Design a protein around this ligand. Structure first.
Ligand SMILES: Cn1nc(C(C)(C)C)cc1NC(=O)Nc1ccc(Cl)cc1
Ligand SMILES: CCCCCCCCO[C@@H]1O[C@H](CO)[C@@H](O)[C@H](O)[C@H]1O
Length: 336
Protein backbone atom coordinates (compact mmCIF):
# COMPACT_ATOMS: atom_id res chain seq x y z
CA UNK A 1 0.00 0.00 0.00
CA UNK A 2 1.22 3.54 -0.93
CA UNK A 3 1.45 6.45 1.53
CA UNK A 4 -1.38 8.90 1.02
CA UNK A 5 -1.48 12.65 1.51
CA UNK A 6 -4.51 14.93 1.66
CA UNK A 7 -5.23 18.27 0.12
CA UNK A 8 -8.30 20.43 -0.35
CA UNK A 9 -9.02 21.18 -4.00
CA UNK A 10 -12.21 23.21 -4.62
CA UNK A 11 -14.03 22.34 -1.37
CA UNK A 12 -13.27 18.58 -1.31
CA UNK A 13 -10.52 16.57 0.37
CA UNK A 14 -8.42 14.73 -2.22
CA UNK A 15 -6.37 11.87 -0.76
CA UNK A 16 -3.91 10.38 -3.26
CA UNK A 17 -0.67 8.35 -3.19
CA UNK A 18 2.49 10.50 -2.85
CA UNK A 19 3.40 9.10 -6.27
CA UNK A 20 1.05 11.83 -7.59
CA UNK A 21 2.45 15.32 -7.11
CA UNK A 22 1.41 18.90 -7.92
CA UNK A 23 -2.35 18.25 -8.26
CA UNK A 24 -3.90 21.03 -10.34
CA UNK A 25 -7.67 21.22 -11.14
CA UNK A 26 -8.34 20.96 -14.88
CA UNK A 27 -12.14 20.61 -14.95
CA UNK A 28 -15.27 18.59 -14.14
CA UNK A 29 -17.43 16.55 -14.22
CA UNK A 30 -20.97 15.16 -14.10
CA UNK A 31 -19.73 12.44 -12.38
CA UNK A 32 -16.37 13.71 -11.06
CA UNK A 33 -13.55 16.24 -10.90
CA UNK A 34 -10.21 15.98 -12.65
CA UNK A 35 -6.76 17.28 -11.70
CA UNK A 36 -3.56 17.19 -13.70
CA UNK A 37 -0.80 15.53 -11.61
CA UNK A 38 2.90 14.71 -11.96
CA UNK A 39 3.42 10.93 -11.87
CA UNK A 40 6.77 10.56 -10.08
CA UNK A 41 7.17 6.90 -11.16
CA UNK A 42 7.03 7.63 -14.89
CA UNK A 43 7.90 11.33 -15.09
CA UNK A 44 4.71 11.84 -17.12
CA UNK A 45 1.87 14.25 -16.40
CA UNK A 46 -1.42 12.36 -15.81
CA UNK A 47 -5.14 12.93 -15.19
CA UNK A 48 -6.55 11.98 -11.82
CA UNK A 49 -10.35 11.90 -11.59
CA UNK A 50 -12.02 11.77 -8.15
CA UNK A 51 -15.40 10.16 -8.81
CA UNK A 52 -18.02 12.17 -6.86
CA UNK A 53 -20.68 10.30 -4.88
CA UNK A 54 -19.75 7.01 -6.53
CA UNK A 55 -22.10 5.01 -4.27
CA UNK A 56 -24.85 7.62 -3.82
CA UNK A 57 -27.55 5.27 -5.12
CA UNK A 58 -27.96 2.05 -7.17
CA UNK A 59 -27.60 4.08 -10.39
CA UNK A 60 -24.40 5.80 -9.19
CA UNK A 61 -23.03 2.53 -7.82
CA UNK A 62 -23.64 0.66 -11.09
CA UNK A 63 -22.17 3.56 -13.10
CA UNK A 64 -19.16 3.39 -10.81
CA UNK A 65 -18.73 -0.42 -11.30
CA UNK A 66 -19.18 0.13 -15.06
CA UNK A 67 -16.31 2.66 -15.00
CA UNK A 68 -13.99 0.14 -13.44
CA UNK A 69 -15.06 -2.67 -15.76
CA UNK A 70 -14.91 -0.57 -18.97
CA UNK A 71 -11.67 1.23 -18.22
CA UNK A 72 -9.85 -1.91 -17.00
CA UNK A 73 -10.86 -3.60 -20.23
CA UNK A 74 -10.12 -0.84 -22.76
CA UNK A 75 -6.58 -1.44 -24.03
CA UNK A 76 -6.15 0.53 -27.27
CA UNK A 77 -4.17 3.58 -28.41
CA UNK A 78 -7.36 5.46 -29.52
CA UNK A 79 -9.47 4.60 -26.49
CA UNK A 80 -9.24 5.87 -22.92
CA UNK A 81 -7.79 3.29 -20.51
CA UNK A 82 -6.59 2.97 -16.91
CA UNK A 83 -3.07 3.83 -15.83
CA UNK A 84 -4.06 3.44 -12.13
CA UNK A 85 -7.06 3.18 -9.83
CA UNK A 86 -6.91 3.71 -6.09
CA UNK A 87 -8.87 4.35 -2.90
CA UNK A 88 -7.48 5.57 0.48
CA UNK A 89 -9.80 3.01 2.12
CA UNK A 90 -8.21 0.09 3.84
CA UNK A 91 -10.95 -2.60 3.87
CA UNK A 92 -14.41 -2.66 2.24
CA UNK A 93 -16.09 -1.20 5.41
CA UNK A 94 -14.29 2.11 4.77
CA UNK A 95 -14.73 2.05 0.98
CA UNK A 96 -16.29 5.32 -0.16
CA UNK A 97 -13.92 7.12 -2.57
CA UNK A 98 -12.62 6.02 -6.01
CA UNK A 99 -9.88 7.70 -8.04
CA UNK A 100 -9.13 7.03 -11.66
CA UNK A 101 -5.82 7.77 -13.35
CA UNK A 102 -5.53 8.04 -17.13
CA UNK A 103 -3.39 9.83 -19.76
CA UNK A 104 -3.59 13.63 -19.64
CA UNK A 105 -4.58 14.78 -23.14
CA UNK A 106 -5.09 18.53 -22.57
CA UNK A 107 -7.73 19.31 -25.23
CA UNK A 108 -10.84 17.98 -26.90
CA UNK A 109 -11.92 17.97 -30.54
CA UNK A 110 -14.38 20.84 -30.02
CA UNK A 111 -11.42 23.04 -29.02
CA UNK A 112 -9.65 22.07 -32.27
CA UNK A 113 -12.65 22.66 -34.65
CA UNK A 114 -13.35 26.09 -33.10
CA UNK A 115 -9.76 27.37 -33.27
CA UNK A 116 -7.94 25.64 -36.12
CA UNK A 117 -8.59 25.66 -39.84
CA UNK A 118 -8.04 21.91 -40.40
CA UNK A 119 -6.48 20.61 -43.60
CA UNK A 120 -7.69 17.46 -45.38
CA UNK A 121 -4.73 15.56 -43.93
CA UNK A 122 -5.85 16.44 -40.40
CA UNK A 123 -9.37 15.22 -41.14
CA UNK A 124 -7.92 11.98 -42.56
CA UNK A 125 -5.79 11.37 -39.48
CA UNK A 126 -8.46 12.37 -36.92
CA UNK A 127 -11.35 10.37 -38.41
CA UNK A 128 -9.00 7.41 -39.03
CA UNK A 129 -8.13 7.32 -35.30
CA UNK A 130 -11.81 7.58 -34.29
CA UNK A 131 -12.73 4.70 -36.60
CA UNK A 132 -9.73 2.68 -35.36
CA UNK A 133 -10.83 3.11 -31.73
CA UNK A 134 -14.43 2.47 -32.71
CA UNK A 135 -13.54 -0.80 -34.50
CA UNK A 136 -11.98 -1.92 -31.18
CA UNK A 137 -14.94 -0.67 -29.08
CA UNK A 138 -17.47 -2.35 -31.40
CA UNK A 139 -15.52 -5.65 -31.39
CA UNK A 140 -16.17 -5.78 -27.63
CA UNK A 141 -19.98 -5.53 -28.26
CA UNK A 142 -20.02 -1.97 -26.88
CA UNK A 143 -21.99 0.86 -28.44
CA UNK A 144 -20.71 4.32 -27.52
CA UNK A 145 -24.09 6.11 -28.12
CA UNK A 146 -22.61 9.57 -27.42
CA UNK A 147 -19.84 10.20 -29.89
CA UNK A 148 -19.38 13.94 -30.13
CA UNK A 149 -16.43 16.39 -30.29
CA UNK A 150 -16.33 16.93 -26.49
CA UNK A 151 -15.93 13.14 -25.99
CA UNK A 152 -12.84 13.03 -28.22
CA UNK A 153 -9.51 13.92 -26.58
CA UNK A 154 -6.71 15.16 -28.84
CA UNK A 155 -3.11 16.10 -27.95
CA UNK A 156 -0.74 18.61 -29.70
CA UNK A 157 0.45 15.68 -31.87
CA UNK A 158 -3.17 15.40 -33.17
CA UNK A 159 -3.23 11.97 -31.52
CA UNK A 160 -6.78 11.05 -30.47
CA UNK A 161 -8.55 8.99 -27.80
CA UNK A 162 -12.25 8.24 -27.57
CA UNK A 163 -13.73 8.95 -24.16
CA UNK A 164 -17.21 8.28 -22.75
CA UNK A 165 -17.17 11.20 -20.32
CA UNK A 166 -16.10 14.62 -21.65
CA UNK A 167 -14.07 17.19 -19.66
CA UNK A 168 -20.90 20.30 -28.20
CA UNK A 169 -23.56 18.66 -27.69
CA UNK A 170 -25.37 15.92 -27.91
CA UNK A 171 -28.45 15.70 -30.17
CA UNK A 172 -26.52 17.23 -33.11
CA UNK A 173 -24.49 13.98 -33.46
CA UNK A 174 -27.26 11.53 -32.61
CA UNK A 175 -28.48 8.90 -35.04
CA UNK A 176 -32.12 9.55 -36.20
CA UNK A 177 -33.36 6.20 -34.78
CA UNK A 178 -32.22 7.12 -31.24
CA UNK A 179 -34.33 10.31 -31.28
CA UNK A 180 -37.21 8.22 -32.65
CA UNK A 181 -36.47 5.94 -29.65
CA UNK A 182 -36.48 2.71 -31.69
CA UNK A 183 -34.90 0.99 -28.61
CA UNK A 184 -33.23 -1.41 -30.03
CA UNK A 185 -30.36 -0.26 -32.26
CA UNK A 186 -27.08 -1.35 -33.72
CA UNK A 187 -23.43 -0.24 -33.56
CA UNK A 188 -23.76 1.97 -36.65
CA UNK A 189 -25.53 4.61 -34.50
CA UNK A 190 -21.88 5.50 -33.80
CA UNK A 191 -21.04 5.62 -37.52
CA UNK A 192 -23.76 8.26 -37.97
CA UNK A 193 -22.10 10.34 -35.26
CA UNK A 194 -18.67 9.93 -36.92
CA UNK A 195 -20.19 11.21 -40.20
CA UNK A 196 -21.56 14.27 -38.38
CA UNK A 197 -18.16 14.87 -36.79
CA UNK A 198 -16.28 14.38 -40.06
CA UNK A 199 -18.62 16.71 -41.96
CA UNK A 200 -18.08 19.41 -39.27
CA UNK A 201 -14.25 19.14 -39.43
CA UNK A 202 -14.36 19.53 -43.23
CA UNK A 203 -16.70 22.54 -43.29
CA UNK A 204 -16.20 24.12 -39.84
CA UNK A 205 -20.00 24.06 -39.40
CA UNK A 206 -22.21 21.78 -37.31
CA UNK A 207 -23.93 19.58 -39.93
CA UNK A 208 -27.28 19.33 -38.14
CA UNK A 209 -27.57 22.04 -35.45
CA UNK A 210 -31.16 21.20 -34.35
CA UNK A 211 -32.89 23.28 -31.66
CA UNK A 212 -34.63 20.13 -30.32
CA UNK A 213 -35.34 16.50 -31.24
CA UNK A 214 -38.01 17.47 -33.76
CA UNK A 215 -35.92 20.17 -35.47
CA UNK A 216 -33.07 17.62 -35.56
CA UNK A 217 -35.17 15.20 -37.66
CA UNK A 218 -36.20 18.02 -40.04
CA UNK A 219 -32.56 19.00 -40.64
CA UNK A 220 -31.43 15.42 -41.21
CA UNK A 221 -34.22 14.89 -43.82
CA UNK A 222 -33.28 18.12 -45.62
CA UNK A 223 -29.89 16.58 -46.42
CA UNK A 224 -30.55 12.87 -46.80
CA UNK A 225 -34.07 13.12 -48.21
CA UNK A 226 -37.41 11.55 -47.26
CA UNK A 227 -37.12 7.84 -46.41
CA UNK A 228 -38.14 5.46 -49.17
CA UNK A 229 -41.01 2.99 -48.81
CA UNK A 230 -38.78 0.16 -47.52
CA UNK A 231 -37.68 2.33 -44.63
CA UNK A 232 -41.04 3.97 -43.91
CA UNK A 233 -42.56 0.46 -43.49
CA UNK A 234 -40.32 -0.14 -40.42
CA UNK A 235 -41.54 2.82 -38.39
CA UNK A 236 -44.12 1.54 -35.94
CA UNK A 237 -45.00 4.98 -34.61
CA UNK A 238 -47.96 6.74 -36.22
CA UNK A 239 -46.93 10.22 -35.02
CA UNK A 240 -43.34 9.72 -36.23
CA UNK A 241 -44.77 8.61 -39.60
CA UNK A 242 -47.04 11.64 -39.78
CA UNK A 243 -44.18 13.98 -38.88
CA UNK A 244 -41.83 12.44 -41.45
CA UNK A 245 -44.45 12.28 -44.21
CA UNK A 246 -45.81 15.78 -43.50
CA UNK A 247 -42.48 17.49 -44.29
CA UNK A 248 -43.40 17.97 -48.00
CA UNK A 249 -41.23 15.33 -49.75
CA UNK A 250 -37.52 16.18 -49.62
CA UNK A 251 -35.11 15.21 -52.44
CA UNK A 252 -31.78 13.81 -51.22
CA UNK A 253 -29.22 16.57 -51.63
CA UNK A 254 -26.16 16.24 -53.79
CA UNK A 255 -23.47 15.60 -51.14
CA UNK A 256 -21.08 16.81 -53.85
CA UNK A 257 -22.75 20.26 -53.56
CA UNK A 258 -23.17 20.30 -49.76
CA UNK A 259 -19.50 19.46 -49.34
CA UNK A 260 -18.01 21.22 -52.45
CA UNK A 261 -14.31 21.93 -52.01
CA UNK A 262 -13.85 18.74 -49.93
CA UNK A 263 -11.71 15.81 -51.10
CA UNK A 264 -14.17 13.76 -53.20
CA UNK A 265 -12.97 10.66 -51.30
CA UNK A 266 -14.18 12.38 -48.09
CA UNK A 267 -17.58 13.05 -49.69
CA UNK A 268 -17.92 9.43 -50.91
CA UNK A 269 -17.21 8.23 -47.34
CA UNK A 270 -19.70 10.73 -45.83
CA UNK A 271 -22.37 9.34 -48.18
CA UNK A 272 -21.65 5.86 -46.82
CA UNK A 273 -21.85 7.00 -43.16
CA UNK A 274 -24.83 9.33 -43.27
CA UNK A 275 -27.34 6.77 -44.57
CA UNK A 276 -30.78 6.71 -42.94
CA UNK A 277 -30.97 2.88 -43.08
CA UNK A 278 -28.67 1.71 -40.29
CA UNK A 279 -28.44 -1.72 -41.98
CA UNK A 280 -26.82 0.07 -44.96
CA UNK A 281 -24.35 2.21 -43.01
CA UNK A 282 -20.67 1.43 -43.40
CA UNK A 283 -19.16 -0.28 -40.32
CA UNK A 284 -15.97 0.95 -38.61
CA UNK A 285 -14.03 -2.02 -40.08
CA UNK A 286 -15.25 -1.31 -43.62
CA UNK A 287 -14.62 2.46 -43.27
CA UNK A 288 -10.95 1.91 -42.32
CA UNK A 289 -10.46 0.10 -45.66
CA UNK A 290 -12.03 3.08 -47.55
CA UNK A 291 -9.61 4.79 -49.99
CA UNK A 292 -9.89 8.07 -48.04
CA UNK A 293 -7.60 6.48 -45.43
CA UNK A 294 -5.09 4.93 -47.90
CA UNK A 295 -2.22 6.85 -46.27
CA UNK A 296 -3.14 5.58 -42.78
CA UNK A 297 -4.82 2.17 -43.12
CA UNK A 298 -2.80 -0.89 -41.95
CA UNK A 299 -5.00 -4.01 -41.67
CA UNK A 300 -2.25 -5.52 -39.47
CA UNK A 301 -2.44 -2.64 -36.98
CA UNK A 302 -6.16 -2.21 -36.35
CA UNK A 303 -6.71 -4.64 -33.49
CA UNK A 304 -9.91 -5.93 -31.87
CA UNK A 305 -10.81 -6.32 -28.18
CA UNK A 306 -10.57 -9.35 -25.94
CA UNK A 307 -14.14 -10.56 -25.30
CA UNK A 308 -15.90 -8.29 -22.76
CA UNK A 309 -18.26 -9.56 -20.06
CA UNK A 310 -21.10 -7.09 -19.66
CA UNK A 311 -23.69 -9.49 -18.26
CA UNK A 312 -23.61 -7.18 -15.18
CA UNK A 313 -25.58 -4.65 -17.26
CA UNK A 314 -28.49 -7.09 -16.84
CA UNK A 315 -28.38 -7.21 -13.06
CA UNK A 316 -30.36 -5.15 -10.57
CA UNK A 317 -28.18 -5.25 -7.47
CA UNK A 318 -28.09 -3.47 -4.14
CA UNK A 319 -25.68 -0.58 -3.52
CA UNK A 320 -23.44 -2.67 -1.22
CA UNK A 321 -23.19 -5.41 -3.87
CA UNK A 322 -22.07 -2.98 -6.60
CA UNK A 323 -19.75 -1.41 -4.07
CA UNK A 324 -18.23 -4.75 -3.11
CA UNK A 325 -17.75 -5.75 -6.77
CA UNK A 326 -16.17 -2.32 -7.50
CA UNK A 327 -13.89 -2.77 -4.51
CA UNK A 328 -12.83 -6.18 -5.93
CA UNK A 329 -12.03 -4.51 -9.26
CA UNK A 330 -9.91 -1.84 -7.55
CA UNK A 331 -7.86 -4.46 -5.65
CA UNK A 332 -7.32 -6.80 -8.59
CA UNK A 333 -6.08 -3.99 -10.87
CA UNK A 334 -2.72 -4.63 -12.58
CA UNK A 335 -1.13 -1.54 -14.24
CA UNK A 336 0.26 -1.64 -17.81
C1 LIG B 1 -18.57 5.65 -19.80
N1 LIG B 1 -17.35 5.42 -20.61
N2 LIG B 1 -17.57 4.72 -21.81
C2 LIG B 1 -16.35 4.68 -22.37
C3 LIG B 1 -16.07 4.00 -23.69
C4 LIG B 1 -17.36 3.51 -24.34
C5 LIG B 1 -15.40 5.00 -24.64
C6 LIG B 1 -15.19 2.76 -23.43
C7 LIG B 1 -15.35 5.28 -21.61
C8 LIG B 1 -16.05 5.76 -20.51
N3 LIG B 1 -15.69 6.42 -19.40
C9 LIG B 1 -14.86 7.48 -19.37
O1 LIG B 1 -14.57 8.10 -20.39
N4 LIG B 1 -14.40 7.81 -18.15
C10 LIG B 1 -13.43 8.73 -17.87
C11 LIG B 1 -12.64 8.52 -16.73
C12 LIG B 1 -11.63 9.43 -16.37
C13 LIG B 1 -11.42 10.57 -17.16
CL1 LIG B 1 -10.14 11.74 -16.70
C14 LIG B 1 -12.22 10.80 -18.29
C15 LIG B 1 -13.22 9.88 -18.65
C1 LIG C 1 -35.23 11.29 -39.84
C2 LIG C 1 -36.21 10.15 -39.68
C3 LIG C 1 -35.87 9.01 -40.62
C4 LIG C 1 -35.97 7.65 -39.95
C5 LIG C 1 -34.63 6.97 -39.88
C6 LIG C 1 -34.75 5.52 -40.32
C7 LIG C 1 -33.81 4.66 -39.50
C8 LIG C 1 -33.51 3.37 -40.24
O1 LIG C 1 -32.63 2.51 -39.50
C9 LIG C 1 -33.30 1.39 -38.91
O2 LIG C 1 -32.79 1.23 -37.58
C10 LIG C 1 -33.49 0.25 -36.80
C11 LIG C 1 -32.87 0.25 -35.41
O3 LIG C 1 -31.52 -0.21 -35.50
C12 LIG C 1 -33.41 -1.14 -37.45
O4 LIG C 1 -34.19 -2.09 -36.70
C13 LIG C 1 -33.87 -1.06 -38.91
O5 LIG C 1 -33.67 -2.32 -39.57
C14 LIG C 1 -33.12 0.06 -39.65
O6 LIG C 1 -33.66 0.12 -40.97
Amino acid sequence: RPTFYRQELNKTIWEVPERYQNLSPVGSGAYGSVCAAFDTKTGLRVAVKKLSRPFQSIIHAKRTYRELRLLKHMKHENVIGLLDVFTPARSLEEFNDVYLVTHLMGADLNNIVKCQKLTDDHVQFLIYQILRGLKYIHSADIIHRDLKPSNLAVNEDCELKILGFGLVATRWYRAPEIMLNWMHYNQTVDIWSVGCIMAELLTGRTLFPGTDHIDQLKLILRLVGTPGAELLKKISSESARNYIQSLTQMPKMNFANVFIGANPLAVDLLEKMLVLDSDKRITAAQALAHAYFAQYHDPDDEPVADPYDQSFESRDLLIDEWKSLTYDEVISFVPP
